[PDB]
Design an enzyme around this catalytic site. Structure first.
Site, PDB file in Angstrom:
ATOM      1  N   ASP A  35      16.636  31.777  17.210  1.00 24.51           N
ATOM      2  CA  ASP A  35      15.640  32.334  18.392  1.00 24.51           C
ATOM      3  C   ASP A  35      15.581  33.697  18.274  1.00 24.51           C
ATOM      4  O   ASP A  35      16.637  34.468  18.590  1.00 24.51           O
ATOM      5  CB  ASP A  35      16.134  31.858  19.341  1.00 24.51           C
ATOM      6  CG  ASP A  35      15.055  31.969  20.733  1.00 24.51           C
ATOM      7  OD1 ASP A  35      13.835  32.398  20.056  1.00 24.51           O
ATOM      8  OD2 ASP A  35      15.174  31.590  21.818  1.00 24.51           O
ATOM      9  N   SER A 199       0.777  45.513  16.888  1.00 28.80           N
ATOM     10  CA  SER A 199      -0.125  44.831  15.820  1.00 28.80           C
ATOM     11  C   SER A 199      -1.443  45.750  15.925  1.00 28.80           C
ATOM     12  O   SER A 199      -1.691  46.521  16.924  1.00 28.80           O
ATOM     13  CB  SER A 199      -0.517  43.522  15.979  1.00 28.80           C
ATOM     14  OG  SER A 199      -1.612  43.115  15.138  1.00 28.80           O
TER      15      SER A 199
END
Length: 330
Positions: A35, A199
């Protein structure tokens, strides 16, 4: 030192991925959910409430000669899925694909949530986010990656998730054999303790790419791709029949329909998720409503690049201190 381990998904929709891990002496092998958006290594155990253990494999810390109580130490986590877990802590030798880390905090659960209890495959979580997140009190503990780093040839790991298919977690080195073309490294913000990056925009199918910064986390621990309401509206508008549902709680579409691919910008480069990846099948058995893999982030307060997005790229968590996230095609 390096290590590589094979990660296999746990059902046909690739909901999560499990990686086998050796804990204790001698070794008890547990399938862990790696994770990168939490910072706790926790396992189902000996202490775990027996109204809360399934066919899960259990860590017995009385059979490990390397195992010792961290006296007074205690943990409690909450997941963005609402997930809940807690108990007391041990220190033991932990191995992943032949990378051994000694004196790793192994957080043994006394209590686990419905979610974890109904999850046969998964035996616990191995957090690979930054250590500032780890939950253990009152002496806060370090991640497996944090413990491995200096021992490593490089202080990186790579994630190479498969679509309906196993893939690999590599620690210490980069397979120049796993991706195509160039790796595009982008700046990471370590402030929230996430693999948190920015992004450079998106396109839907063969549409024109919109330049627009999407701030989100790389999170192998989340199934879906979580983007903001504007972006996810533009996607599902290209799928006839796609609607947002009050009841089901997310965009669904008709299963007979066609998913046009999704592109996300990593600086100058671009990563297509193909539209196959975004089909998460029918909302219930028999239903001709299918569940979409791109959902709005509006409700959780951060954008998550989860498995849907990572499983379309060869990712590298550069754990320098100019820490850098690399993407490539595969």
């Amino acid at each position: 030192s390096t290590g590589s381990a094979t990660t296999t998904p746990i059902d046909s929709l690739d909901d999560a991925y499990i990686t086998p891990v050796q804990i204790g002496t001698p070794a008890q092998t547990l399938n862990l959910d790696f994770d990168t958006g939490s910072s706790d290594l926790w396992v189902f155990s000996s202490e775990t409430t027996a109204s809360e253990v399934d066919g899960q494999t259990i860590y017995t810390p009385s059979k490990s000669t390397t195992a010792k109580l961290l006296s007074g130490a205690t943990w409690s986590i909450s997941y963005g899925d609402g997930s809940s877990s807690s108990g007391d802590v041990y220190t033991d030798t932990v191995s992943v694909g032949g990378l051994t880390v000694t004196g790793q905090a192994v957080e043994s659960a006394k209590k686990v949530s419905s979610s974890f209890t109904e999850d046969s495959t998964i035996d616990g979580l191995l957090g690979l986010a930054f250590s500032t997140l780890n939950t253990v009190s009152p002496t806060q503990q370090k991640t497996f990656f944090d413990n491995a780093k200096a021992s490593l040839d490089s202080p990186v790991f790579t994630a190479d998730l498969g679509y309906h298919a196993p893939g690999t977690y590599n620690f210490g080195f980069i397979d120049t054999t796993a991706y195509t073309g160039s790796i595009t490294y982008t700046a990471v913000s370590t402030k929230q303790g996430f693999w948190e990056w920015t992004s450079t925009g998106y396109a839907v199918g063969s549409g024109t790419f919109k330049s627009t910064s999407i701030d989100g986390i790389a999170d192998t621990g989340t199934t879906l791709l979580y983007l903001p309401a504007t972006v996810v509206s533009a996607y599902w508008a290209q799928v006839s029949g796609a609607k947002s549902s009050s009841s089901v709680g997310g965009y669904v579409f008709p299963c007979s329909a066609t998913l046009p691919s999704f592109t996300f910008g990593v600086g100058s480069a671009r990563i297509v998720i193909p539209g196959d990846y975004i089909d998460f099948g029918p909302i219930s058995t028999g239903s001709s409503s299918c569940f979409g893999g791109i959902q709005s982030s509006a409700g959780i307060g951060i954008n998550i690049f989860g498995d849907v997005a990572l499983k379309a790229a060869f990712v590298v968590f550069n754990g320098a201190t100019t820490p850098t996230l690399g993407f490539a095609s595969k």
